Amino acid sequence: TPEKVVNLFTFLAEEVREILAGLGFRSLNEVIGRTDLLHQVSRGAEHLDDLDLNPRLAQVDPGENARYCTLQGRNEVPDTLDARIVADARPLFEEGEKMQLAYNARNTQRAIGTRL
Amino acid sequence: FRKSGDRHGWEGGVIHTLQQAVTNDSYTTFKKYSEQVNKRPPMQLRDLLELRSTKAPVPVDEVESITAIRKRFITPGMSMGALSPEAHGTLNVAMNRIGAKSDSGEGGEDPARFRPD
């Protein structure tokens, strides 16, 4: 039943809200990348395992950029030949009539005829 | 056209070579056509002229595309009275396929053809 999955996700979100409120922040953005809030504790003085998690606790300083994605939309790519074709075969998309085009191809033109 | 008479623009060999080049779709035969047309004695004013530039040649692949040039031609008006409806229709269909313009000429036009097939 979908209600089951909805309830599971709701409980999982409420737990994260509780934990964030207990720490002292008000958003998941304020906690992304903040490694200094994590400490390592040993199991005890009877196991004597020398695990040092510091290699994963290392905090590189970002600089003037933020610690997460700060851009909208996808990463755009340069335009191929197809653009020109879309400029020419307009009666096909406006009326639905047969067309016939000719061009020149070069090996630096990838995905010839995919956007169409 | 006669053997003893003057020279004309459209002779038999020219017509046959053009029709062959356009029926088989072979560019070499069209080049033969152009060679056979542009080598006769001067018959018009534009035969006494010569093209002579001074810049250096460029590769052909950098010249503007075909369609951008084909959209500069048309077919002049030829009324449906003179031509058969078959030829008029074939001209109008063939020109609307490459993006260029065709003509209607005098003598009106069949209204039923105001919509595509």
From Swiss-Prot, chain B:
The UniProt similarity line reads:
Belongs to the glutamate synthase family.
Q: Any extra detail in the entry?
A: Glutamine binds to the large subunit and transfers the amido group to 2-oxo-glutamate that apparently binds to the small subunit.
Which ranges are annotated Basic and acidic residues under compositional bias? Answer: 110-117
Membrane-crossing residue ranges in chain numbering? none
**Region of interest: Disordered:** 100-117
Q: Quaternary arrangement and interactors, per the entry?
A: Aggregate of 4 catalytic active heterodimers, consisting of a large and a small subunit.
State the taxonomy lineage: Bacteria, Pseudomonadati, Pseudomonadota, Alphaproteobacteria, Rhodospirillales
Shown portion of the complete protein runs from 817 to 933 of 1515
Q: What is this protein called?
A: Glutamate synthase [NADPH] large chain
